[PDB]
Each structure stands twice: as C-alpha cells, then as structure tokens.
C-alpha cells in the first residue's frame, strides 16, 4: 500500500498473471505484466504496471499499487497463455475461442488480431472444445483439455492442423514439453502418460506411476531451455524431476511440502530460480534447476541437491557414494527450501518472479509485489 512491499486489493479473481517481456530482456527493468479476468463478468486481458522501489529506468513512484496501463476485450473466455513472442499473445478459452492479440511496443496498446470462433478444427469448421493449459514453443502451440483433448497450432501460420479428441480417464490439468514428437501429461491422482505426435484411437500408450507416495498432481511446467526438464507441484509433493526423457517408470521421488502447491514458476531471464507458492501463505525460492551444478542455497526437503567442488582430503581412505536403482529414493535434486514467509497470508493462488521482482495473486482477491533481496 504505502509502506514495505506493495499490497493492492484489486477485488477480482487472479487467474493467469504473467509478466510480459516488453520491459524484460532489455535495458529497461521489468514492471509491466498482464492479467486475465477469468471467473468474472467479462473475460478481459488487462495489461498493468507495478510500482517498484528506486528508479533505475523511469519506474513508477508512490510506494506500490499497480495501475492498469491498458486492457483488451473479446467475446471469448480466458484460461491461460504462454509468451511465445513479445508482441504475440495466444489465449485459449473453455468455449472454443482462441484469441491471438497483437501488442504494440511502440504504442503500449493492445489490438484484436485474430479471434478463432471456429478453433480446434482440422476436418471442417464450427468446433467448440474446452481448454485447460496452453503452452507454446518453437514452432508449435499445444493446448490440452480435461478429457485428453489435444490441439496443435503452428507458429508460422494462423490455422489449426491437429485436433485429437479421444476418451481418457481421470482429469488432466497442465502440460509440459519434451521434444517435437513426445508429450508428457500428468493426472489428478499421480499418473504420467506419454503420447506421441501420431496417436490414433483410444487407450493411452505408456502410463507410469511412482511407488510409495502418490498424491494428486496439480501444477506442472517445463523449462524454457531444455524441454525435458519438468517442474511439478501438487498436493503433498510428488514431482519427477529428470534431466532427460527416457526410461519407463520415473525413478525420481521428491516428496515435501504437505500444503497444496497451486503454481510453480521459473525465472524467465536466468532459468535457474524456481518460485513455489503454498496454500497457507508461503513463498519458497529454489536455486539451480537440476542441470545447473552450483552450491545449493540451503538444504530443506527430501532431495539429493547438487554436487560442487571438493578438496582437502585426509591421507586415509574416504568414499564417493555408490550406485543404486529404486523408485523410492530421489535421484535429481531441485527443492532448496528458503525460509521467507512461514505464515503471513491466509491463502495464495499464483506467483510469478522476474529479474528481481515477485508478484503474487492470492485467493482473497489481492496482489502483492515484493522486491527480492537474496540470490
């Protein structure tokens, strides 16, 4: 509000809030973001700007309270979106209305480019299929639904050329990446399904689970660089972090945080800092996204962490671990618990970190903006 970190009461559902690369990946500091207005009266994408401390690139004044720089309107709904380009933003809907908007950097405004009223088409037109998670990469944008419905769009043309509508069990919420011909989907119980680019008929291809602890998986995200790196956060913690994309059943088991994790975000600039939110009002910051071998920032959690340089050994006889294969002990480290906020907020929905600023939308219709001080 007027002291310490920024706290605003926008009084609206904080669905999908993501920082745009307009003020990022440049000399300017990140401060401009976008928010979808899902579960409201009118699903509108609003571009806002926060107020950070100091002034390194003509930042906002006061002590906080973000302000809406612009807003766009569309008859479709708002689910989520993945920043494929700085000026292109593709948002899906649960009623089959894909909105591709054109953001002008030289104008700081939004223009309605494409509104696919007949999206998810491949053998005709006028098709309505709900969507749950839409993620983009080079050169395909993949959207998943609830009953296993998959939709694929190209980045070089404005058309849909792949719509697979099968009959799957349970419910799938989220989608990660692997390569140009593999898709890994998580279930709401603890199952992992591996599908190919050319799959016909019912019956999933490969289904795997984790022995021991099986909690409902919730949020799942992919690494912006290596696609085979997956960060998952569910109920009591059950992610299968792996630096590859082979093997049958996942040999990794990282069980921590009994509270339900609703979203786990990555650092877009330097993909080596993960930020995880808790349902009891907690924000954990993990370092070294598995592949990055560096000294860990404090332990915490049932994980193997990473190894660094070792020197100064006694003239006796030491050891250097061993080799074992089991589906119970962890294999890849990732969780680095950092005590930041034990219990301050009654509920927390989503969070997003960029450069040195973290936005956090809570379930009580509020937003918090905090400038990081650690590393």
């Amino acid at each position: 509000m007027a002291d310490k970190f920024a706290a605003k009461f926008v009084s609206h559902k904080i669905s999908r809030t993501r920082w745009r690369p307009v003020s990022a990946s440049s000399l300017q500091q990140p401060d401009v973001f976008a928010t979808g207005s899902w579960d409201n009266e009118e699903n509108k994408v609003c571009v806002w700007a926060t107020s950070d401390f100091g002034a390194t690139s003509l930042d906002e004044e006061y002590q906080g309270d973000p302000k809406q720089l612009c807003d766009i309107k569309h008859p479709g709904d708002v689910m989520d979106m993945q920043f494929l380009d700085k000026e292109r933003i593709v948002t899906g809907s649960s009623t089959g209305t894909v909105t591709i908007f054109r953001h002008h950097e030289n104008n700081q405004t939004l223009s309605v480019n494409q509104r696919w009223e007949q999206a998810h088409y491949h053998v005709g037109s006028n098709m309505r299929a709900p969507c749950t998670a839409i993620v983009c990469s080079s050169p395909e944008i993949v959207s998943v639904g609830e009953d296993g419905r998959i939709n694929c769009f190209r980045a070089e043309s404005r058309d849909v050329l792949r719509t697979i509508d099968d009959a799957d069990s349970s419910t799938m919420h989220g989608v990660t990446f692997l390569r140009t011909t593999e898709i890994l989907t998580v279930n709401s119980v603890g199952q992992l399904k591996l599908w190919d680019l050319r799959k016909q008929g019912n019956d999933p291809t490969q289904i795997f689970s984790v022995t021991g602890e099986r909690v409902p998986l919730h949020c799942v995200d992919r690494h912006p660089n290596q696609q085979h790196v997956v960060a998952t956060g569910g109920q009591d913690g059950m992610l299968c972090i792996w630096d590859v994309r082979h093997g049958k059943m996942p040999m990794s088991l990282l069980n921590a945080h009994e509270a339900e994790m609703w979203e786990v975000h990555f650092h877009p600039s330097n993909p080596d800092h993960l930020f995880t939110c808790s349902e009891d009002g907690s924000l954990w910051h993990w370092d070294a996204s598995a592949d990055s071998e560096k000294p860990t920032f404090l332990l915490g959690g049932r994980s193997t962490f990473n190894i660094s340089r070792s020197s100064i050994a006694p003239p006796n006889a030491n050891q250097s671990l061993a080799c074992a294969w089991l589906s119970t002990d962890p294999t890849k480290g990732q969780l680095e618990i950092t005590n930041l906020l034990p219990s301050s907020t009654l509920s927390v929905n989503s969070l997003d970190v960029l450069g040195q600023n973290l936005v956090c939308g809570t379930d009580a219709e509020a937003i918090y903006v905090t400038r990081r001080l650690f590393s």
């Binding site: 006694p314 003239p315 006796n316 006889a317």
Partner: protein, 91 residues
C-alpha cells in the same frame, strides 16, 4: 599443562602433524617424526596412540616401513645418497 592443552585442542593438530609427517619430504618428515617420538615419550594416558591406531593409520605406517626398507636398499646399493639419510634412519 601441555598435555591438557593438547587434549583440549583434540585431533586437529594431531591430524595436521600426521599429514605433515606422512606426506612430507626428508628434513621435515624427520623433524615431525622426532616430535612424535618426543610427545609419545612424554605421554601418560596413551589415548593419542589409541586414536592413532583407531584412525586407520596402520596402512600408512606399513607404507612408511616400506619406504624405510627402500631407503635401506638404496643405502646398501653402491653410491649412497646424502648424509641426512643416516640421521633420518636413526630417528
């Protein structure tokens, strides 16, 4: 007082002296071995020797004995080395 200070220090200086004596050269190794001999002579509780035997230094002592045997073979062979080897073997 010296023994009490050594016991209060613990195994840090002991391990340092052991490393300097094992992974040494000639004069330094001989001086460290003489210091160990003197501290063993002035010892009274044998806990230092017990710790040396429990820390697994038996293989290192065997290697030191093998090095001493190699030095003795080199001395028995013609053309002996420096005169410091005699004092090293004496210590």
């Amino acid at each position: 007082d010296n023994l009490s200070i050594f016991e209060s220090y613990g195994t840090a200086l002991m391990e340092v002296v052991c490393r300097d004596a094992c992974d040494g050269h000639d004069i330094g190794r001989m001086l460290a071995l003489a210091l160990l001999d003197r501290i063993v002579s002035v010892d009274r509780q044998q806990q230092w020797l017990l710790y040396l035997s429990n820390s697994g230094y038996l293989k290192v002592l065997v290697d030191s004995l093998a090095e001493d045997d190699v030095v003795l073979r080199n001395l028995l062979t013609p053309q002996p080395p420096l005169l410091k080897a005699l004092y090293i073997y004496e210590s």
